[model samples]
Target: KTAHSQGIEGKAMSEEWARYYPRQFDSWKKTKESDNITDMLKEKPALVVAWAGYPFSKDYNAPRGHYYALQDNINTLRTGAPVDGKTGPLPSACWTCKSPDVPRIIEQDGELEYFTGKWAKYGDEIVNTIGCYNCHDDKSAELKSKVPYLDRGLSAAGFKTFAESTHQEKRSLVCAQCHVEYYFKKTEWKDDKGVDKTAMVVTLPWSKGISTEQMEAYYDEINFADWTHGISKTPMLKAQHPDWELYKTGIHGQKGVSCADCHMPYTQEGAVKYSDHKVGNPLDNMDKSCMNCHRESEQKLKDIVKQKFERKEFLQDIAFDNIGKAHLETGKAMELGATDAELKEIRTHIRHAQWRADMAIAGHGSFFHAPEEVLRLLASGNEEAQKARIKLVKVLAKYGAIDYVAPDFETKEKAQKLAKVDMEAFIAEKLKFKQTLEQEWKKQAIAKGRLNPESLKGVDEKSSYYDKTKK
Candidate 1:
């Protein structure tokens, strides 16, 4: 039966099929579990240092499941309780991508109301997982998609079309639900109705352009940095996932293939064909994935992905080496009592190096999305990093500190030490605090009668919640 006939909103997967295929459904459900926390934390610790001043540095982890969103945010060190009884982690902007609560709050309280305050202030109220509101417009998905806001903003700023942008655009756009770079704009501006609203508006820095250099220029124009790096003393720019941007520069993008084309390939069972919503790496299902379109052998396609990944790794290594060199050189210059002018130049170099490195590493899928662009970005980072170091060495020489290569800069730990991070103490403290807080939370929930031990089951195949009614 077709999706419409089966009353299965977006795609057709029969009730009996979902019931019998518990393995598949269960695995999909695990996408909301918390057991994957260890894996999430292990994949990226460098991110911890990069976001040093931001809440992310305190407790960032790779997202495991939608279910963990609220708990993760609360448990993170970045969102520590305020000394003054304030109710936020760092900024109200943190809630933008976290939950459906954002939309509901905004609808009731007004946009500026929602955007003003600390994240934790609304933590109690904002409890839902990232869901429907993130991607779909409850009113009319066709007429009221959220992405058009960015596109419209870009167009108003005099840029051409953001994407070649067909239905294919929607495929990648859906992933932008949790990916892509954004910043909070706190400008006093008139709203559509000509009333003044000093809101911390969420904006993408894409109007200036998409390249690392272009983004840097935009940030420089605004003198923007998420925070000054604690160790490097450089005004560091944090890159959110630029998956769509990097993907645009890839072979698949060039061929007009969207992420959904691979990650959520069409599936058929009996007489029904539907788009799979469990988005992830296409490699997880080779037979029903890319081979369906490319007509190539599964092994060949796998090799392509593998080769792309290796190339990306090599480029990343080059970028990291450059960043290391730049940091050491900058420190040497500082030690040599370099003049303010010289230090500014050195900082600029460090900024560019970090920016390039960030852009290159932001998109986890860049290796497969755009291997060539990944290499290009890395090469740019290396060149910029080396240039910064070269200049720093000259400045150091002027202060009679020539031939200083800056020792103790080998491993990530060594770098953190150089930056004056007390890693062990910090980790221990955070762990202890979290353990106590979790117990408190559990007790509170139990006291409130909100704790349920029973498992909620049954697949509502006909539920409109899963329906993509318009598209």
Candidate 2:
């Protein structure tokens, strides 16, 4: 009625507009993390063996609905068990992409200070989970932003003017903002007075290029590493998902197919033709997504796609087994007194191997599209892991432990027990801390009067989602 008289400048976020948008949700959330983690151990104890010294081995699990983000993060063993005021061994930087409130806090307070503290420091302030505004300009979710980490990451891939990229690219770019590979760079930045200081800041290693090798070279040049292998005493790098990078190399990506083309393609549900907001398998919406391009039967096309990337998966496994073996052997060698100088090449290989494995496996299904690239990267990881093992053999020779110790990787609990991790006590302690911290978060949230309806529920990625990836 109001717009009919003066004429409107733009459309409102009216009920009609709201109804036009899709409201589908991912179904995988039905399977809880406790079930998955238990399932993981029951199926493959080697995974736990691969992550022996890491927190993942303490309590590893897969994710579910976006609704469960805060629950998952607070519940996960990675953040460690934090009591009331004390945070786990995680930092504030871990919250960067988890909640949209993070960007708000960064805006309100000093940006640098926002990044350098403990994860629990801002838990009270970061009460909301991922929602409409984290990526977009407003509740409409029609426009997007260049979140700090994402902007920096895309720049590394040579897209400095990220906002200027094609519409198709932006679809993927929006996802890449938090999805690409990155590491916390510890370096000194200059103030106006030029004082020297170092802070653990996040940086994307795409400056060289986005390939597995390119990012690896960039990290090595900087002498960067994530953690030292507890057993092998070797430097390591953890690869996060690089879906956008790998997707671009795929056939669909090459043919002007944005991530939205498949995962969020438009559909004529009853009458309205709008894109599905629920992002997932392209095959799930075959009529609208696949039929637009391919002519094969739905199952045949799915099979074709699956069969095409089968070898890449096969290579990744071989490489994974080798890398696990290398991690295992190196741990033994170091315990028996292997020197860094003697293990330098081996450590380098580990570094190279993780990088290679990640480039292939990091992307959700992006690797399948770039089968050659994934194959090459996995082969490289296999070779490097093998080389690391070869060198490790000589290191172990000093102790006369010529045979590989076939340790118990029989179950998750057994794996942890063998590694001397008291799972029950650890889980109990972590859970107690989680309950305390979350209660504290709620208590402070109410006192601060910052609690949104969503916040009352919990933080989503717009909440506390720090995404991780494969072994």
Candidate 3:
């Protein structure tokens, strides 16, 4: 008899539609989705050293809610041409999960059209961020989740179709739509060998399973590489957030704990209980979300969270600490012009270590999500990290330095400075890019009737019995 969020019974197309779900929108605003990674890259020069010539080194940050999608993507140093009118290095497929506009464009044009161009191509169409249409059908009476991305990826991986899924599975899989790990790869499969000879397709390597090793093997078989490393010159793979992949292997997910059950826990609104759309930390409402199963005091449960957090943090530091050391040594060696032939094994070790470490820390709560898998990956990364450094050390000994020089993670003010990064020129370009991009889109969208202010009025207002604007 009630919708998930209060005051949002009828979702409108207005920009303010987000405000209707106060709990979901507001609570998320306060959640810790800070620019933590961007800050890390700014501080931990070793990260910059590792990702020396990548856009990630230019700007990487923890993601925020849907509302900030366009703004965040545009503002982040990673996307948006700093020179304003020009396009950035990223492709348009990057915005697939950023807003509801993506689906609209996909509807008008084809999915291939949406996936085949520069990101700026659809700047105007993707104005609205996470909205109701994302999870549920808007025109239908029964608001069911609708995620085509998951459908396509699952289809490609030989999984059951979304239409054939169970009710409980649908509830959880809705969230899994975008919360899992993925990558952009261009492959020529038997089916699409001629049709899609090459398109930057967001793919899942889950043909085997969701385990770190399994996904690694899948990628290996495809020989996929996200980018070529600047320092090690190794073909590197970037890990997306594997929250759902890792979570499914954990106790809660295995015990039938759907994503909505925990994150969007039921909230009592004086006799009428509705699911809270806050989509935030379950710990924030442990009584409603976790108490049913745990049956433990708040302190005890939080203590468990704290312990696992620290436990993982310990391994995480060890894993990355070693990786960082290897990168620093490798960076210096590159500066000295280490031969690609001589650094062959060293490059491979760096690639393996970084991939393993990324797998361990890919998700926000992976440490607690799948402890066994995360820890296993961390140990594997540590072993590779040390091996990479050992090799780097031997290479360095060729010159004169016997001891390995360390990256001062304490006061590491290294970033694009290591190589050639002109922050000034980059920023000037982006300033023009936004203004020009928006204006151009606005005009085209209006001429095509794509921007409808009628959506500003909710369903009730759309067919109002009496007109107020007339007066």
Candidate 4:
């Protein structure tokens, strides 16, 4: 764990770590193409309706490899690059999970200063992708958490501190630093002049617990809503993927399985056995991952996984339909002159319904993590959505508009239009911003000797993620 043979000490780039971990590094790089496609909106257009009024509605895609973590964050439409590299739609806290430079900045300037600015404030500084320093102390090469949020969250969840936790717990905590659900909690801080200012600090909602209902209650108690629904005009709580929470409730989690146990299964390579770095679905290598424990055939294990996903999707589609329709129906009720008093309960119902559905859907692996829990959440959401519709119909009748019909939002474009999103403007602005930001940041990174100009040759930033891959 000493300095590499290259004589570079305190190096932050992942490539530097590769000199001593070629196998692990090579395996990690394979993630560049893993689920890298960016057409979720086109695939299931209803998602656009679900995240209406939010940047996620503008662009959402399956995550690729950790190698592209920072790249994908910058390219995604959600972050919206700042024209001046100092102001943007999102705060600097948004970059917390994308790079190791985040902890470097926190170490240099402190958490408050690192988190209380626009996403672009540290754009030039956070050039390296996720790597060794994010989860390990460079000096000691020991498993550690670099973010304060996770430390506090662990305590809130009644777990031991990172130092006191078992090695197995630490493995999962390393991933939970970003995988768990969190919110930008608004807090007051003082500056050099002793003037009080407010900033959104990253905080976990685990004070109550990590279950879907517990976290929801915590948000409700604080009257927290991530954004207002553009269609229904109701305040909404968007669920970030709570993979760690859902996994903890699953049978595997209950039986003492850690995330790395399967996702990063150990493998033998010429007598130098090491935990695989190609963190992904266990089904990809069942012999060393899943089959190591189970006696089932490879095909049988895969079939069981497939069955879970199919069942989840079937119920998910129903939840999406009812919840999406509830939003549109609420909009109609408002237009028909429904008073705020009469619409209050309807809004709460829709908000609860959407939150439940989003909780299950947001975590891409929730069904596999806890299929029973996912189904329960989805069923509850469907029931809540129907309740909203039932009240909505009565309101429409009261206004003598009983024959009202909801618009057909059968596609992403249609849903966006109904949600009042100007797709043309969002796409154009994001495309232009990505081009400028990438050019500006990459130029700075290269000049600082942080990146190789040769590595970027022939790469196109102006095109869609898939478009650039066509050649």
In terms of lDDT, the best-performing candidate is 4
| Model 2 lowest lDDT segment of ten | 7-16
Candidates' lDDT values, in order?
Answer: 0.60, 0.63, 0.65, 0.80
lDDT tens per residue, model 2, 75-167: 666777666344578777777765666667776665566765577777787765444445554333444753676677667677754577877
By TM-score, who's the top model here?
4
Residue ranges of candidate 1 with Cα displaced over 4 Å: 1-30, 33-60, 81-89, 138-166, 188-199, 409-412, 424-471
3 or 4: which has the higher lDDT?
4
Across residues 1-471, which tens digit of lDDT does each residue of candidate 3 receive? 334334333242433445444554454443223212235554344455556566766655555434455456656667746222236678777877766677666766666656775777666666555556666654442434444667766676576666777867777777777788888765333223355433466676787677777888887787777888765567777777888888888887788778888887787789876776656667878998888777769999888988988888788778877876776677778777778787878877877887887888778677777787788888998898898888888888886765757645533334355434665666566656645765566557556655554332221111001122311
Pull out the clashing pairs in model 3: 24-278, 82-429, 82-430, 83-429, 83-430, 84-429, 84-430, 84-432, 84-433, 92-119
The reply for model 2, stretches above 4 Å from the true place, is 1-44, 139-142, 187-199, 268-273, 308-313, 367-369, 406-410, 417-420, 446-449, 452-471
**TM-score attained by model 3:** 0.81
Clashes of 1: 4
**Tens digit of per-residue lDDT, candidate 4, span 262-320:** 88998777977888888766777899888778996999889998999999999888998
Per-model TM-score versus the true fold: 0.78, 0.82, 0.81, 0.94
